[PDB]
Write a protein that holds these residues in place. Structure first.
Motif, short mmCIF file in Angstrom:
data_model
loop_
_atom_site.label_atom_id
_atom_site.label_comp_id
_atom_site.label_asym_id
_atom_site.label_seq_id
_atom_site.Cartn_x
_atom_site.Cartn_y
_atom_site.Cartn_z
N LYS A 1 0.73 -1.17 -0.04
CA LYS A 1 0.19 -0.14 -0.02
C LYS A 1 0.98 1.22 -0.09
CE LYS A 1 -3.38 -0.34 2.63
NZ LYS A 1 -4.25 0.18 4.01
N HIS B 1 11.78 -5.65 -16.17
CA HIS B 1 12.64 -6.09 -15.33
C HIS B 1 13.56 -4.96 -14.77
CE1 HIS B 1 14.26 -10.16 -17.41
NE2 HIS B 1 12.85 -10.40 -16.88
N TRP C 1 7.06 4.03 -29.54
CA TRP C 1 8.48 3.70 -29.25
C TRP C 1 8.88 3.38 -27.67
CZ3 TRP C 1 13.19 6.18 -32.26
CH2 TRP C 1 12.69 6.82 -33.30
N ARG C 2 8.04 2.04 -27.29
CA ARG C 2 8.63 1.44 -26.01
C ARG C 2 8.52 2.47 -24.79
NH1 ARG C 2 13.93 -2.25 -27.03
NH2 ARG C 2 13.11 -2.85 -24.99
N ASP D 1 -10.12 12.23 -3.51
CA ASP D 1 -11.00 11.51 -2.75
C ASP D 1 -9.90 10.47 -2.00
OD1 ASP D 1 -12.62 9.69 -1.23
OD2 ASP D 1 -12.64 8.18 -3.08
N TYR D 2 -9.22 9.75 -2.56
CA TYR D 2 -8.54 8.73 -2.41
C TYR D 2 -7.12 9.05 -1.40
CZ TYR D 2 -5.63 4.33 -2.63
OH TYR D 2 -5.18 3.08 -2.29
N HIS E 1 -7.49 12.39 0.25
CA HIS E 1 -7.97 13.03 1.54
C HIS E 1 -7.40 14.48 1.46
CE1 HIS E 1 -7.78 8.78 3.22
NE2 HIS E 1 -8.80 8.79 2.92
#
Ligand code: MG
Lengths: 104, 71, 53, 124, 98
Positions: free
Chosen positions: E5, E28, E64-65, E81-82, E84
């Motif tokens: 988290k 990787h 391109w990647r 919201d998430y 606060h």
């Protein structure tokens, strides 16, 4: 004070480079700075040669790509402020200019 | 690029045994605590984490690859 | 989970891949392009290479 | 905010204490957060489970720093923390009761919301 | 776990602070560069933004990647919201552009 100072110019299109060089020469000789004329270093050519075909089929044709690089130098004998000023002006197109502290 | 062959050992996971939560503390007089298993004296484990007891081994759960004692 | 998720890929064709198509197999290392041989004919102009030989 | 009521005190402190990262929910985390000196206020409800982990919580609040508040009705403080964060905690899908809490850090110190426990600690 | 988290919040707050995210398509490399670099593998950044995009909240391009992720209005609201925040704060992008 008075210092040697060398400006090196590089590009791939010749006309822009030559016109830039001649204009810097003008702006230097309007102040009577004892300019040492443009020295033309040898042009460089980068070559890359590849098969034309995406896959492996066909008669075996090749491309020959190349890019060219032009490089010249001018030398000034003067204080730094005038040269870093006039250098900072009169360059519209795509051309590389690099100016150093001293080269003599 | 073709049909597989039958395996005879398929077992994805261990079934992760489920236990009733916490009997590692013993209240042993009214208002008195006893600790049945010490808290791993590893500097990073906060001494509020209980070290395991095996049949002859003490092993620290949070010291992932250290604190095993032979008795 | 896993501590075996790679083994040295520090040279040879496993190390390197095209900066566009992500393929291996026939890339140009010259001048530091690092570009697939087919992908380069595609941008051979925007870089500045022109064919006139 | 309210008038220092116990049934407002939990609701008031909780809503700042989730943001102040304070709540060791559940019993094992409450224990592990009491065995370190991070705890401040501890909460318990009526017995719907083991009749001895109640003895666990009161012995633990006793053994270091007496600070316990007891409030029954497990599902209430459950729904007050009823989902993992503050929006539709009243969603009946999940409404587990806490049946224990430890506050570590009792929110931004404010609005007499912590003073309610100060009105109890040496008074009760 | 999909990620800690701690890692999630560290990614979301960075995306909100700036308003736009970037990562190369590579699973990787051990740390994302940029302000996640002290902590987070860029596998988590990719995997996180994928979930965020499947719920609106974000527009995604790839050339391109390299992914380019923009935060849209729904994203502003959900992140506000998430995390606060003061329900009217946005350092993401605020100036009239001449
Ligand atoms: Mg020659």
């Amino acid at each position: 004070a008075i210092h040697r100072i060398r400006i090196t110019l590089t590009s791939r299109n010749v006309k822009s480079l030559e016109k830039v060089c001649a204009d810097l020469i003008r702006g230097a000789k309007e102040k009577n700075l004892k300019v040492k004329g443009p020295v033309r270093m040898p042009t460089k050519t980068l070559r890359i040669t590849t098969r034309k075909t995406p896959c492996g089929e066909g008669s075996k044709t090749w491309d020959r790509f190349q890019m060219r690089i032009h490089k010249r130098l001018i030398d000034l004998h003067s204080p730094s402020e005038i040269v870093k000023q006039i250098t900072s002006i009169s360059i519209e197109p795509g051309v590389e200019v690099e100016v150093t502290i001293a080269d003599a | 690029k073709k049909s597989y062959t039958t395996p005879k050992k398929n077992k994805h996971k261990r079934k992760k045994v489920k236990l009733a939560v916490l009997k590692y503390y013993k209240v042993d007089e009214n208002g008195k605590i006893s600790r049945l298993r010490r808290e791993c004296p590893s500097d990073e484990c906060g001494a509020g984490v209980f070290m395991a007891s095996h049949f002859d081994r003490h092993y620290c759960g949070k010291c992932c690859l250290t604190y095993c004692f032979n008795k | 989970q896993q501590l075996y998720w790679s083994h040295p890929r520090k040279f040879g064709q496993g190390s390197r891949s095209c900066r566009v198509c992500s393929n291996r197999h026939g890339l140009i290392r010259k001048y530091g392009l690092n570009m697939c041989r087919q992908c380069f004919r595609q941008y051979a102009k925007d870089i500045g290479f022109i064919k006139l030989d | 905010g309210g008038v220092m009521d116990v049934n407002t005190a939990l609701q008031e402190v909780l809503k700042t204490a989730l943001i102040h990262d304070g709540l060791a929910r559940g019993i094992r985390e409450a224990a592990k957060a009491l065995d370190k000196r991070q705890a401040h206020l501890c909460v318990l409800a009526s017995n719907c489970d083991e009749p001895m982990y109640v003895k666990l919580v009161e012995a633990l609040c006793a053994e270091h720093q007496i600070n316990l508040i007891k409030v029954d009705d497990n599902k209430k403080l459950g729904e007050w923390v009823g989902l993992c964060k503050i929006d539709r905690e009243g969603k009946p899908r999940k409404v587990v009761g806490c049946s224990c809490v430890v506050v570590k850090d009792y929110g931004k110190e404010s609005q007499a919301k912590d003073v309610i426990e100060e009105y109890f600690k040496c008074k009760k | 776990m999909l990620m800690p988290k701690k890692n999630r919040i560290a990614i979301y707050e960075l995306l909100f602070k700036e308003g736009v995210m970037v990562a190369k398509k590579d699973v990787h490399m051990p740390k994302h560069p940029e302000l996640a670099d002290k902590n987070v593998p860029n596998l988590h950044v990719m995997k996180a933004m994928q979930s965020l995009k499947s719920r609106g909240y974000v527009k995604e391009q790839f050339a391109w990647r390299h992914f380019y992720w923009y935060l849209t209005n729904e994203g502003i609201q959900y992140l506000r919201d998430y995390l606060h925040l003061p329900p009217e704060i946005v350092p993401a992008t605020l100036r009239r552009s001449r």
